[PDB]
From Swiss-Prot, chain A:
Molecular chaperone; assists the folding of proteins upon ATP hydrolysis. Known to play a role, in vitro, in the folding of actin and tubulin. In yeast may play a role in mitotic spindle formation. Heterooligomeric complex of about 850 to 900 kDa that forms two stacked rings, 12 to 16 nm in diameter. The chain holds residues 49 to 96 of 528 of the full protein. This is T-complex protein 1 subunit delta. It comes from the Eukaryota. It comes from Saccharomyces cerevisiae (strain ATCC 204508 / S288c). Belongs to the TCP-1 chaperonin family. Present with 5530 molecules/cell in log phase SD medium. It is found in: Cytoplasm.
From Swiss-Prot, chain B:
This is T-complex protein 1 subunit eta. It comes from Saccharomyces cerevisiae (strain ATCC 204508 / S288c). Heterooligomeric complex of about 850 to 900 kDa that forms two stacked rings, 12 to 16 nm in diameter. GO terms for molecular function: ATP binding; ATP hydrolysis activity; ATP-dependent protein folding chaperone; unfolded protein binding. The lineage of its organism: Eukaryota, Fungi, Dikarya, Ascomycota, Saccharomycotina. It is found in: Cytoplasm. Its main location: cytoplasm. Pfam families: Cpn60_TCP1. The gene is CCT7. Keywords: ATP-binding, Chaperone, Cytoplasm, Nucleotide-binding.
UniProtKB/Swiss-Prot annotation, chain C:
This is T-complex protein 1 subunit theta. GO terms for biological process: chaperone mediated protein folding independent of cofactor; protein folding. Belongs to the TCP-1 chaperonin family. The gene is CCT8. It comes from Saccharomyces cerevisiae (strain ATCC 204508 / S288c). Molecular chaperone; assists the folding of proteins upon ATP hydrolysis. Known to play a role, in vitro, in the folding of actin and tubulin. In yeast may play a role in mitotic spindle formation. It comes from the Eukaryota. The lineage of its organism: Eukaryota, Fungi, Dikarya, Ascomycota, Saccharomycotina. It is found in: Cytoplasm. Heterooligomeric complex of about 850 to 900 kDa that forms two stacked rings, 12 to 16 nm in diameter.
From Swiss-Prot, chain D:
GO terms for biological process: chaperone mediated protein folding independent of cofactor; protein folding. It is found in: Cytoplasm. Changing residue 32 to E: Temperature-sensitive. Its main location: cytoplasm. PROSITE patterns: TCP1_1, TCP1_2, TCP1_3. This is T-complex protein 1 subunit alpha. The keyword ATP-binding applies. Gene3D superfamilies: GroEL, GroEL-like equatorial domain, TCP-1-like chaperonin intermediate domain. One of its GO terms (cellular component) is chaperonin-containing T-complex.
Length: 48, 507, 525, 528
């Protein structure tokens, strides 16, 4: 549930990490990893 | 109030039911519970778990009241009584949504238990003859309980020493107070000793410690409640005195009163003199020259066990001691374990009791060991009046479970569903076993339906080989007569909780 | 509208609670007192005892219920629901404009009328006096008010208890009053219903003195009850020991031993089988007591000694002397048998004579369920009292069938009393309609099915045939709940005439007291 | 933000959906009753329809919005009998908690339900009813008596059975490349206060509720070939320019020239010949007087949505402004349609123009009279929903017996199907078969009867039908009577429900429970 009330139900790793609220400085860079997996691979995100 | 109050009373039992799930079975785990006595209880059997459990909701005390009834009755595996009674209340949630009254539920479970009393007699068989008997049958029944809780690997050495202690019990007497033992801290976990008599720790120290002889060949036992110390008289010590020399005579009289009684202790000549009250340092250096065993601060329970062993008595007057008040035993050997000396009474005139000396620093280990001895006397009592047993592992209830489904199928309409829920509630015993063993409850319970129908009767569930086999032929057995009062007690308690629609709390 | 009305809402909370606690299909409750006392029972009488009373009419109901426990005590919630139903009907009568005086007159004139209608429902006129067999059959339906699970086992425990206390003396023996306090039930944790036994003597839980009670197999003994407890000799006021010299210092302890030699040997000279000691004694008493084989009762209570005088049959000696051969009790066997894991000292005899004040050992798994059985024994012996002290209590049709015929009788009385009595009497029969609806509500049946069954039996008419089926048929639910009719003669479910006779006077008294209250006055409370 | 993992999420989701589900279960079956909702804003609606209630109800946990969207999907599929549909998937979540506590994997719970519904399609085909099947006099009346259930209008079934059937017979049109179907949602329902349902009027066509602006205008138009013109052009004093703005006589001439053209624009309508003209925005008495001399029936304060269905049904071209290929303002004769019969009738202290015999698009309107607005609130949504059942009845002749006949029958097929699959999925079939039986059990709860007594007898009659393949009939029987509590064939009682409604009910209920079982955790981000 986002700040505006958007409900998204999925197992996609890139979608979950996109709206995930992370208070850890290094763990925020893990979202960039999922962003590169969608641009380069873009398939089987749940397995990757 | 209403249907919601009954669910609130059931939910109070669910917290106890969910905590007792690991507490059943050999492969069941343990739960940690802290009490107000600063005693951390880690145990398998739920016998002492329900006593030390903190009760929050008032309705949860119903399972505690029925636990003490089955505590002195069975004591081993009684945690399944509240689990089965909890399943009867848990499976009653869809029944509360319907218009079925609790009294219609009362008649449903009663007809299943009334037949179950007859089935247990039919499912079992008289053994007797040249088959398993004393020194054999007692070892098979005691090994099931004990090895299913603690000392899993070393149970071969540990249980064998405890079974040999119960062998001293004989028929025609069968006293129930013979299970009294003591707790010995310290030592190795795999080391244990056998003692046929009362053992009591020093608990105090005095200058004549190292001078106390530990070995008496033919001691004489004497019990006295007289405390040895300089203290005021019983009521009033006020003495009117005129002359000055009489005040030193009072000091002499206070000494002569004690010193004359000190000579009367050594005048008897009994090599064992026990004081019910503490012993001070005033009589130490005197009585030490006589070189007779002495122990102070002895508990009143240990003094009563000596009276019931050698037939002694406690007297406050030495001149009134009768010739039979001095008891004798076969041998007296004082053992010292961890700088703590222990007296030993061997060869009492009549002793059927065996006090097991344990070792180790963990206090929670003896909880089930004392409970195992409480179950050991139950095995002896239930092997005499009626001779029969059933299979072990907990699969006995699954044999009668399907027998209730077959009979009640054709019996009076709606009463089929209520009894079928009882037979469904009997499946929780193997269900909690398959959960803690990492097995598959679906495949096993489906095979039991054929194992309890086309598989005749005695085939049980084997945890060691992860297969289904006969526990009766395996020689591992479980007491049959303990399930009669266990199944009937849970029904009257469940019918009482479901009949309470409101709870009143003053203040 | 703020006093005579709102006062009903205070009882309405307790009235709804009594609807589910009445009948064999009723519901139990959990009670937690302010001091920590826990009570679980289906009877609302004990509930109102420990519950804090705020509204004044609540104390009126518990005192009226206490009057039933002194007399009857069987189905006390019947009149409580009837009294609570009058308050629900009162809201209908007050809305009509009837004054509080005329409403009481409607209930008062119907009270004397209802007492006269109790003679028309009389059945089972004759009853045996000293016959136990017929008594065991009529006491069985009395248990149906409480838990009906086993009525046979509870009757067998009463059978062995009455057989001892019963004076017998067939024909006319000048039979005295049967003592209720003589029979005393003791709750024992553990065991099934069949494990319970009956002790002809006094069942005590304590430790035996020397070893265990024995030697009484040859019988022929003498037991004397001592009212004065045996203790260390002392004066009334607190004294101080004053020694004139040092020689008396060593003789003080020896002087007390001389008293033990004098007192314990003098009381043991006659060889009493069982001595009654209400206080503590020293350890030196075992010298003379174990020598002569005397059994010792250690620290009993106050109420257990009054019942012991009728067991051993010994004269209550006011002072403690040497046992007098003139006044002595006759006791044969005294043994100690282990039951629930501890040695239980019992005074039970074997034949040889029949004394009074027996006891019953009650063994059960659930201690909470034993409270209802303990109250069932009190109501069980109360059923015998109605057939004992009075000439007879006879019988009346139970299961609410008696109140059904009264509805037609009260209806006919309303047609003959015009004026304000028309609204009072016709609604007075409505107060009797809650009794059959209470049994049907606890059973879960639909009222729509029960209503024509209640109208069929006693309301329609009585045919000219002798002993019509309407009188011997009633509302009972086993398998017949679909039909709604059952014969009460085969099941033999009956109630005594004294049950409803005392309830009608309470129903009017409870209505007269509450409905006459103009306002509630409380000063610093 | 706030994130919780484990069974705490699935437990709070089921308890939240079950709490709001038990509220709408009181409306199940003919014995159900409506309920009131307090919106705190001053508006309230009393109805048993779950589509509106779940939309109005504030959803606390975000998992509850899945069941809300489920009711919205039923409107696009069927839309009627929501009391008997949306409560089916609510029972699957209760028994799912016991399976989660077990070692069964959540996908195995899902896979067990997938093979259950996929095989249940053939199970429905066994009890499936053909187009003819039972007597089926008009085959609509037998279904019309079923639509009276689930609602409080069942007491009027002596009328509404003839009302809905006789009205929808003229709705048949040719569309979708020669497909014969009823254009649902094109039926206009009118409400009137007073009397009872027996005063309703059936209009084989379109009926608009409105009167003439001036009382001096003729209120009666009779005869055939009646032309109607929908004019949405606003007639009012024109506003100024972009703000550049601009002898007051020449300034007043602006209104004189505009109103002069407005009078000429009406004269162009006079030459058209249309008997009825419509005007959206209001006008003064100047332009109203011209309509009197025009000998044409006008109407003002018209709703735009009402005129959109007029141009569709009649076929005339809706004209929002008068223009042509040139710079001349006029009205061409090619923008008018034709109708078989058009007449205005007086009904309930009011009048309405009845447009019948529409050649372009055929439809029908139902003008009903009732107690009041609050009494017709339930009767409104109920009749709008009953239009879909009659559509699905004649579109597909497949129907099924109602009153718990399907749920009681599917249990027997799944009993032999559970042992067929076996392994770990056998327990999932048993829980799925027992969950379908909860709906007919809750049916007798609202009727204050004993359901288990009927289910035990009803299932025994369906069992004797399946156990004997060759069968005269000593065994076969079905149906459940709520009033008398007996088992009787529904051919006499007349309760039958379309198959397409029940198939799509269980088809959508499958993915409803799976959406909850696929949620591992729930996280909520605080708003800005």
């Amino acid at each position: 549930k986002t700040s505006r009330g958007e409900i998204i139900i999925s197992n996609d790793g890139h979608t979950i990490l996109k709206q995930m609220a992370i208070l850890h400085p290094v763990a925020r860079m893990l979202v960039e990893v999922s962003a590169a997996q969608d641009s380069e691979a873009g398939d089987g995100t749940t397995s990757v | 109030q209403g249907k919601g109050q009954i669910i609130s009373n059931i939910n109070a039992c669910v917290a106890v039911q969910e905590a007792l799930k690991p507490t059943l079975g050999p492969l069941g785990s343990d739960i940690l519970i802290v009490t107000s006595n600063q005693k951390t209880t880690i145990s398998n059997d739920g016998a002492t778990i329900l006593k030390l459990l903190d009760v929050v909701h008032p309705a949860a005390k119903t399972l505690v009241d029925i636990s003490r009834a089955q505590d002195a009755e069975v004591g081993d595996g009684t945690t399944s009584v509240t689990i089965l009674a909890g399943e009867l209340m848990k499976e009653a949630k869809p029944f509360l949504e319907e218009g079925i009254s609790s009294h219609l539920i009362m008649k449903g479970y009663r007809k299943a238990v009334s037949l179950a009393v007859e089935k247990i007699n039919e499912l079992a068989v008289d053994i007797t003859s040249e088959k398993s008997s004393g020194r054999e049958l007692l070892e098979r029944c005691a090994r099931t309980a004990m090895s299913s809780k603690l000392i899993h690997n070393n149970a071969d050495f540990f249980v064998k020493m405890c079974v040999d202690a119960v062998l001293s019990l004989d028929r025609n007497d069968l006293d129930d107070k013979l299970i009294g033992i003591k707790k010995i801290p310290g030592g190795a976990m795999e080391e244990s000793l056998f003692i046929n008599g009362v053992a009591f720790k020093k608990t105090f120290s005095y200058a004549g410690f190292e001078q106390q002889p530990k070995k008496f060949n033919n001691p004489k036992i004497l019990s006295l409640n007289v405390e040895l110390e300089l203290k005021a008289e019983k009521d009033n010590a006020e003495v009117r005195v005129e002359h000055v020399e009489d005040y030193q005579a009072i000091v002499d009289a206070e000494w002569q009163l004690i010193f004359e009684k000190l000579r009367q202790v050594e005048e008897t000549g009994a090599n064992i003199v026990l004081s019910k009250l503490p012993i001070g340092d005033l009589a130490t250096q005197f009585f030490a020259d006589r070189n007779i065993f002495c122990a102070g601060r002895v508990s009143a329970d240990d003094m009563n066990r000596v009276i019931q062993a050698v037939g002694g008595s406690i007297q406050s007057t030495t001149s009134d001691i009768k010739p039979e008040h001095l008891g004798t035993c076969a041998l007296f050997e004082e053992m010292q374990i961890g700088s703590e000396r222990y007296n030993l009474f061997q060869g009492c005139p009549q002793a059927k009791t065996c006090t097991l000396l344990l070792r180790g620093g963990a206090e929670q280990v003896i909880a089930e060991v004392e409970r195992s001895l409480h179950d050991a006397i139950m095995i002896v009592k239930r092997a005499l009046q009626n001779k029969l047993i059933v299979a072990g592992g907990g699969a006995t209830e699954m044999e009668v479970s399907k027998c209730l489904r077959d009979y009640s199928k054709t019996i009076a309409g709606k009463q089929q569903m209520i009894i079928n829920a009882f037979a469904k509630a009997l499946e929780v015993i193997p269900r909690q076993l398959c959960e803690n063993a990492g097995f598959d409850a679906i495949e096993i319970l489906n095979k039991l339906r054929l194992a309890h129908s086309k598989g005749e009767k005695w085939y049980g569930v084997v945890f060691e080989t992860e297969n289904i086999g006969d526990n009766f032929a395996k020689f591992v057995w479980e007491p049959a007569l303990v399930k009669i009062n266990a199944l009937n007690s849970a029904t009257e308690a469940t019918n009482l909780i479901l009949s309470v629609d409101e709870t009143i709390t003053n203040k | 509208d703020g006093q005579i009305i709102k006062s009903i809402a205070a009882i309405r909370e307790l009235h709804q609670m009594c609807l589910t606690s009445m009948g064999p299909c009723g519901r139990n409750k959990i009670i937690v007192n302010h001091l920590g006392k826990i009570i679980i029972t289906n009877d609302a009488a004990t509930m109102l005892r420990e519950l804090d009373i705020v509204h004044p009419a609540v104390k009126v109901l518990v005192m009226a219920t206490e009057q039933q426990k002194i007399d009857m005590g069987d189905g006390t919630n019947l009149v409580m629901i009837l009294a609570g139903e009058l308050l629900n009907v009162s809201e209908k009568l007050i809305s009509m404009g009837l004054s509080a005086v005329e409403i009481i007159q409607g209930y008062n004139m119907a009270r004397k009328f209802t007492l006269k209608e109790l003679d028309e429902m009389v059945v089972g006129e004759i009853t045996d006096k000293n016959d136990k067999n017929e008594l065991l059959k009529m006491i069985k339906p009395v248990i149906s008010s409480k838990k009906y699970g086993s009525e046979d086992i509870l009757s067998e425990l009463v059978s062995e208890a009455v057989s001892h206390v019963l004076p017998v003396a067939q024909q006319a023996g000048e039979i005295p009053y049967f003592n209720v306090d003589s029979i005393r039930v003791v709750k024992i944790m553990g065991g099934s219903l069949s494990n319970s036994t009956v002790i002809k003597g006094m069942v005590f839980n304590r430790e035996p003195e020397g070893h265990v009670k024995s030697l009484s197999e040859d019988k022929k003994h003498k037991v004397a009850v001592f009212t004065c407890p045996l203790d260390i000799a002392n004066t009334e006021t607190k004294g101080t020991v004053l020694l004139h010299n040092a020689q008396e210092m060593l003789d003080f302890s020896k002087g007390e031993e001389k008293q033990i030699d004098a007192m314990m040997k003098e009381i043991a000279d006659m060889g009493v089988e069982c001595i009654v000691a209400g206080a503590g004694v020293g350890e030196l008493a075992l010298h003379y007591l174990n020598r002569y084989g005397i059994l010792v009762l250690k620290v009993p209570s106050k109420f257990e000694l009054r019942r012991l005088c009728r067991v051993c049959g010994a004269t209550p000696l006011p002072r403690l002397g040497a046992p007098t051969p003139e006044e002595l009790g006759l006791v044969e066997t005294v043994k100690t048998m282990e039951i629930g894991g501890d040695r239980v000292t019992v005074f039970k005899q074997e034949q040889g004579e029949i004394s009074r004040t027996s006891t019953i050992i009650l063994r059960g798994a659930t201690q909470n369920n034993l409270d209802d059985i303990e109250r069932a024994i009190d109501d069980g012996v109360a059923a015998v009292k109605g057939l004992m002290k009075p000439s007879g209590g006879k019988l009346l049709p139970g299961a609410g069938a008696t109140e059904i015929e009264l509805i037609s009788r009260i209806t006919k009385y309303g047609e003959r009393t015009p004026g304000l009595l028309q609204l009072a009497i016709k609604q007075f029969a409505v107060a009797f309609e809650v009794v059959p609806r209470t049994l049907a509500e606890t059973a879960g049946l639909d009222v729509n099915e029960v209503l024509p069954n209640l109208y069929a039996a006693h309301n329609v008419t009585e045919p000219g045939a002798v002993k019509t089926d309407h009188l011997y048929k009633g509302v009972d639910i086993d398998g017949e709940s679909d039909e709604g009719v059952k014969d009460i003669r085969e099941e033999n479910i009956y109630d005594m005439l004294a049950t409803k006779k005392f309830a009608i006077n309470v129903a009017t008294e409870a209505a007269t007291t509450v409905l006459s209250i103009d306002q509630i006055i409380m000063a610093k409370k | 933000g706030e994130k919780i993992s484990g069974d705490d999420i699935r437990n709070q989701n089921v308890l939240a959906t079950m709490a709001v589900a038990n509220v709408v279960k009181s409306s199940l079956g003919p014995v159900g009753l409506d309920k009131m909702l307090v919106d705190d804003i001053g508006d309230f609606t009393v109805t048993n329809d779950g589509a509106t209630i779940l939309s109005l109800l504030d959803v606390q946990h975000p998992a509850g919005k899945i069941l809300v969207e489920l009711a919205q999907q039923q409107d696009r599929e069927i839309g009627d009998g929501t009391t008997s549909v949306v409560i089916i998937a609510s029972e699957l979540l209760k028994r799912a908690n016991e399976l989660v506590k077990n070692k069964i994997h959540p996908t195995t719970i899902i896979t067990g339900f997938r093979v259950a519904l996929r095989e249940a399609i053939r199970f429905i085909n066994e009890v499936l009813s053909t187009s003819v099947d039972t007597l089926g006099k008009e085959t609509l009346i037998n279904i019309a008596k079923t639509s009276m259930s689930s609602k409080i209008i069942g007491a009027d079934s002596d009328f509404f059975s003839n009302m809905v059937v006789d009205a929808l017979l003229a709705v048949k049109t040719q569309n979708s490349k020669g497909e014969i179907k009823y254009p649902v949602k094109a039926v206009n329902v009118l409400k009137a206060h007073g009397k009872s349902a027996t005063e309703s009027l059936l209009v084989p066509g379109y009926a608009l509720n409105c009167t003439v602006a001036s009382q001096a205008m003729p209120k009666r138009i009779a005869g055939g070939n009646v032309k109607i013109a929908c004019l949405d052009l606003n007639l009012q004093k024109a506003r100024m320019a972009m703000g550049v703005q601009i002898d007051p006589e020449q300034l007043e001439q602006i209104r004189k020239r505009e109103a002069g053209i407005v009078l000429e624009r009406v004269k162009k309508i006079i030459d058209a010949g249309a008997q009825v003209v419509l005007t959206t925005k209001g006008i003064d008495d100047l332009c109203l007087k011209e309509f009197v001399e025009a000998k044409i029936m006008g109407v003002r304060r018209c709703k735009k949505e009402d005129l959109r269905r007029i141009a569709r049904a009649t076929g005339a071209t809706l004209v929002s402004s008068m223009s042509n290929l040139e710079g001349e303002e006029t009205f061409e004769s090619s923008y008018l349609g034709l109708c078989d019969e058009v007449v205005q009738a007086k009904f309930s202290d009011d009048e309405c123009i009845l447009i019948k015999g529409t050649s372009k698009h055929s439809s029908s309107s139902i003008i009903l009279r009732g107690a009041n607005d609050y009494s017709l609130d339930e009767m409104e949504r109920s009749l709008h929903d009953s239009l879909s059942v009659v559509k699905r009845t004649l579109e597909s002749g497949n129907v099924v017996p109602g009153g718990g006949c399907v749920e009681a029958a599917l249990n027997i097929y799944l009993d032999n199907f559970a042992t067929t699959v076996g392994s770990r999925e056998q327990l999932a079939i048993a829980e799925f078969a027992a969950a379908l039986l909860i709906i007919p059990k809750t049916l007798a709860v609202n009727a204050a009867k004993d359901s288990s007594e009927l289910v035990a007898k009803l299932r025994s009659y369906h069992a004797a039908s399946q156990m004997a393949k060759p069968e005269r009939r000593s065994y076969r029987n079905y149906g459940l009577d709520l009033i008398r509590g007996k088992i009787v064939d529904e051919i006499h009682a007349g309760v039958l429900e379309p198959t397409i409604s029940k198939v799509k009910s269980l088809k959508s209920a499958l993915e409803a429970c799976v959406a909850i079982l696929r949620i591992d955790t729930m996280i909520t981000v605080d708003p800005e």
